[PDB]
Symmetry: D2
């Protein structure tokens, strides 16, 4: 029975996935993807490429309607008619959307053709994760749609500049992405929500802080941790939580509107909010750790170098710059890393960097790599610790 | 070992897949997709939705460069430098594109970071399949990108009309999709290549021709088979190949430029080419089978009914209309059926139809279902045989 | 590749087995046995039955030579020549024995044809487990070899009497098994070593001692626990270890030579050693628990009933008899339970008993079942708690 | 759910086993055995060794009762009571035997505690396979039971002589096994039935007969195939069946009582029956193939050599001796090969021989190996083709 074999495959893979940790499950997931691509027919390859696109548009519709939040609060299965009337959607349209969503697990369909939430329903109901999906639709899609004709018209140049990539064609502007976004309040509002998502795990799961501290003294009143472009301060909060007895100033640096958003959820004491533009010289002198998490991947080499050169004059011999970012391998990189590389090339002119490419960038700022502490697998995020040469 | 477990999963799934037939492999692939969606983390759900989009854009770039056709005929692994110089691409751009393609199996990357064809490379090198991918990029993507805001601004109506759906917003026109496309030479040229793809299996694998004929007789120059909108005539060719001694005319009906393109590959005798617009009265009277394959799914009910009403006056008591099309189930429909439904809703105002919906449509034309012969699974395509009521 | 498929099966089963507990692994092992029996060819069925017998004979030879104890303490692989010379075995004989042992995992053979311990080597080096294997060879095998012709010559009677079963034919005696064994010094010495094996888990993992005690009070030098035929006293030791502050005497009852052997490993206080023959009236009056673990399965109903009838006059209203023994199900019993049933039928005239059969036996002694506490699965051992009717 | 996981393991292994051929299934079976042995607890190891022995005794009882033949003819499930009354067995004994048999798949137990035949029931109902089981019980078991004390009393000698092994102790005789068996009519009768079993596959599945023939001429009246000790002539029958047009005499040689048994099932023409004792000079001169299947493994080197030396003088330059027998590997031999080695050592003083050991034996007869044609895996049986040196 082919149905019996499929059911047994599902049982065994679900059991193997429970038998391991999140990194093992991520490896299983990538294997399932590779198996699919290798087992599909040629026609199914093109069908998959033609249709998987629709998931983002339909998630965006469900988000607009409030469907995922509503369904995640429902105590019993709901009919399409009930959902349509409650959310203000045409009954036929709602039925067709829900049938599509159930087929890609965006919701679950029951045996009597009613609907309940799935894991994906709950995910899309979370404001920060919903904002990530809406970002993909409104900011990533236009840039990817413009990229092939941009490259064709320009005879396939290497993209190296934030002011000369697919973004300018997609949005009919000469500004770079970050400058243009600052003029679009609806997009700024979505980014504000996006900043509330906290990635897990984080670098403190593997970072040997006491080892890296050595004999560094916080006395008289030195800074332990300067979180440069720290957003909502999640790194600062987790640091104080994990190391509540380590002395030294912990400083969140970001732009004033972001620091105001962060205030509601920062601890009452122990974390300073310091307005600071990281394109200017670093004001905090002689801190133990200057921390840059997912900052430098958004910038081409010239601008990333300037950010580092703004920090180096503040360092003393014991200071370290900690770059927490993606470190793809030299070969066999996975779709999350290479896909991110193509997207930030097209929107920002930047790139993902291997360890050798990080070291080459840091060397231009007078820095040398002392240690690298991986904390995710198989897609590598790592805290890279640099000192003065 | 995580690597050892992952390799063992791949080995066992591959062995199970090779032991079943194409329909069993399709069921396995659908299960792998379901497992992937159920095992991903919330962040990975959003990352998947954010990035899987890039596959179509990068395939379009590879098609523009001629990369897949070139790699499919190479007899040894090629470096990114060699490919860039041969195809006229910037070397860094080519390297980043190839790394992305390898991570989604669009090519294969070797242990010394060179590149060879994968199954997907060969697929994208086939002109008809390449054309399907280009169609997804240039025709489906803009309509899907317009659908969420189209529905929002119109307060979520049921889409019922080809002249009032997302297409009009996407391409800034009041024309319906088919009328507009016929004004766009480059898009027409891609559709001509798309028609060269022949789907397998086909309805003749399960259609009981002898039983359906009964004592039918061709005595007065009558037609056995009229292929309405038959494209390149694949159904006529396969019919003559499988039943070479069955009497009766076999007639391919389409518009003149498609019949012209079909001539090169049609047999030199046995199949007549007859220009005919299926929005006009059917000229062939009393044929045994009037055959409509993947025609009516492109039209809303009102227009699909008019196509049928142009045939019914030509029928005698022995005539049958054979609708060969998708028959999604009442529940548990799969992503290929529901995804198609949402795309053709957005571009064409049409829909996929359950068996009951096909019967309701045909009844408005005065037709009754006599037999239904499935020939694919689990996504069902079937030849539905209708007679006069 | 057959080798690759086989390796992948092993990897996946190993991973599934390590992800469950000991009871889950027992269920997996029973499924592997069932699969093996269902997938063997008819010839392989007979070959398996013909040859699996040799494992006991070869283990006995390895035990006689001291091979498993020696190999378990070796720090490097040993050649067959080295083992033969050390153990005093002909070199060709030793080589052929070791090749056989490696093929059934009794040792492991290395890639350069030397030998190291396997899990089974270590098992057969443990004195109590080695003694169980020697018992199978010298006591169980002769009775099983005599059973078919014993039943044939007697026209297939129900075996009901310890003095009239296959044992008498196998050892050419009119004595029952236990009486005869007590005349055979070498066999007695092996049983003494066998008693040093402690089964895990034990009944204290699920026995709700506090609930079963209720308001029981030890005030007049009363006994909490009387271990009847307790052997080395493992149940008394575990009880004192788990409930060190519970008042009440804890008493180990057995025959003098077994109590003597127990002294070396008993705690120096807290457990009394009391010589007592359980075929005679119980001397300890009004104890809370009279405990019989794996005693009554060795006796037919008439003798098991007499053992219980020697205890019941010592009971007061609060006393309980706790029978800790196998409780096979009414259907679907597993090979360990039914195999034991056939062996003890042939040697001892006794039987395994379902819960209903235990209740019927105990009712003849005027006892009623109050509670049953399983502590192993899927082959069930349980502590059955009986009170006066 | 652990029950769900076990069910899925069974489904997937059953599907993998159907996806391959008999050799692949044999490899899977050996892997299942290895997994069991590696996953059992120490206690379960000794329990398995103690109890698996009982299968042979219980199969022997079922054979005595006619149970397997009766159940294999039953059209519906049978109760233990019905089976007991029909076969003349005590009702309790029958119930306990059937429960044991169901737990080792010797029969199947239904949900309402009735019994139906399994694959093993059908196997044990086949006369030749039943005879193999009865041989294991009455001839192999006594020799294995005597082997440990035989070796101990003799200080572990290398066994080299058919008149000085465990057989003489087991059966209290000074005769060798084959000479003693000739005086025991009940054992001779079982061997007669055993000879009717035909092993599959056979050497003709891979033997390149036309290649090995070369230009050999059967003219004037030469012998193609001389089946030395050919038993019922299965090799001769299959040869004539597969190669019906190859000329040349095909001659079955065996002892007169065996040739008389063979007559009923030999073809009416084309195969000669020739009484011949293979301890005397071969009478047929200059045959192309002198065939010895599973003959020489029953003899120590001295006697096996004499059998070959009786053939060599009959050979001309084109003659070949074909030894069809087991060829275990130099390392990693499997339980069927090593177990057979231990059994024939104990009963016959002989041995299984590697390819090098076959070549060394044949070289003493003036023979050289020309080709080796395997036809079973993973346990190797092969047709080894030898010519004059
Ligand atoms: C080699 C081809 C592989 C294709 C795989 C799946 C294609 C999915 C895709 C939504 C599909 O099915 C259909 C269309 O796009 C269209 C259309 C025709 C013109 C403009 C827009 C859409 C009509 N009618 C369809 O059905
Ligand atoms: C909850 C969020 C989930 C997201 C998962 C995958 C996100 C993939 C995505 C290409 C990504 O990584 C990045 C960006 O889009 C951008 C950006 C910022 C502004 C405009 C366009 C792109 C910058 N820098 C990035 O790195
Ligand atoms: C239908 C039969 C199935 C048997 C499967 C396995 C048989 C294993 C078994 C040790 C075997 O192989 C051999 C013998 O017992 C004997 C023998 C002959 C006479 C007396 C004792 C042993 C000779 N020579 C053998 O080779
Ligand atoms: C370390 C030990 C491992 C043992 C695993 C399974 C042993 C199976 C085995 C049939 C078993 O259970 C029993 C006996 O042999 C006996 C006995 C006692 C004296 C003589 C003969 C049999 C009594 N009562 C039993 O129950
Ligand atoms: N010029 C600038 N100076 C300081 N912060 C900036 C900046 N431009 C952008 N940023 C901030 O950089 C952050 C990038 S995203 C937040 C990443 C953060 N380090 C984390 O991992 O949680 C945003 O908070 C944004 O407000
Ligand atoms: N008005 C019209 N009259 C006749 N054919 C038409 C038409 N409009 C579109 N078509 C044809 O309808 C076909 C739709 S796709 C081809 C489907 C074909 N029946 C097959 O399965 O092989 C195209 O060949 C197109 O040329
Ligand atoms: N007549 C008798 N009186 C008391 N003990 C006896 C006896 N006959 C046998 N025994 C003891 O009964 C025990 C059987 S085996 C030991 C079982 C023990 N209850 C346990 O599970 O740990 C042996 O210790 C043996 O010495
Ligand atoms: N001295 C002897 N001369 C000829 N045949 C003998 C013999 N001693 C035993 N045999 C025969 O050798 C055979 C061994 S078993 C049969 C094996 C046979 N070659 C086959 O594969 O089918 C028996 O038929 C037995 O009768
Ligand atoms: Cl701390
Ligand atoms: Cl890579
Ligand atoms: Cl198809
Ligand atoms: Cl058919
Ligand atoms: Cl146990
Ligand atoms: Cl408890
Ligand atoms: Cl032939
Ligand atoms: Cl070996």
């Amino acid at each position: 029975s082919n149905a019996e074999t499929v059911a047994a495959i599902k049982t065994l893979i679900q059991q193997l996935a429970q038998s391991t940790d999140q990194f093992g499950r991520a490896e299983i997931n990538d294997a399932l993807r590779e198996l699919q691509y290798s087992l599909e027919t040629p026609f199914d390859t093109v069908m998959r490429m033609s249709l998987d696109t629709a998931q983002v548009a339909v998630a965006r519709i469900g988000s607009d309607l409030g469907l995922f939040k509503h369904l995640s609060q429902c105590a019993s299965p709901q009919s399409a008619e009930e959902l349509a009337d409650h959310l203000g959607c045409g009954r036929e349209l709602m039925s067709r959307l829900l049938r599509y969503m159930a087929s890609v697990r965006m919701v679950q369909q029951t045996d009597d053709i009613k609907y309940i939430s799935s894991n994906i329903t709950q995910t899309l109901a979370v404001p920060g994760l919903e904002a990530g999906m809406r970002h993909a639709f409104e900011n990533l899609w236009p840039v990817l749609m413009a990229l092939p004709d941009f490259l064709a018209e320009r005879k396939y140049p290497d993209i190296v500049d934030a002011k000369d990539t697919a973004f300018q064609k997609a949005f009919n502007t000469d500004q770079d992405c970050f400058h243009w976004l600052a003029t679009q309040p609806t997009r700024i509002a979505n980014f504000k929500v996006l900043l509330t998502d906290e990635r897990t795990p984080n670098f403190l799961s593997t970072f040997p802080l006491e080892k890296e501290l050595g004999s560094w003294s916080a006395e008289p009143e030195k800074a332990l941790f300067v979180d440069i472009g720290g957003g909502m301060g999640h790194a600062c909060i987790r640091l104080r939580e994990k190391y509540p007895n380590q002395p030294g100033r912990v400083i969140l640096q970001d732009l004033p509107p972001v620091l105001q958003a962060a205030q509601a959820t920062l601890p009452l004491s122990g974390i300073e909010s310091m307005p600071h533009n990281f394109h200017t010289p670093q004001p905090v002198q002689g801190a133990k750790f200057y921390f840059l998490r997912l900052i430098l991947r958004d910038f081409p080499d010239h601008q990333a170098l300037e950010i580092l050169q703004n920090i180096v004059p503040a360092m003393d011999a014991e200071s370290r710059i900690v770059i927490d970012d993606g470190v793809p391998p030299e070969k066999g990189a996975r779709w999350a890393e290479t896909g991110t590389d193509i997207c930030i090339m097209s929107a920002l002119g930047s790139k993902e960097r291997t360890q050798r490419q990080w070291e080459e960038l840091a060397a231009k700022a007078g820095l040398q790599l002392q240690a690298l502490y991986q904390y995710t697998w198989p897609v590598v995020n790592a805290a890279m610790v640099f000192s003065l040469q």
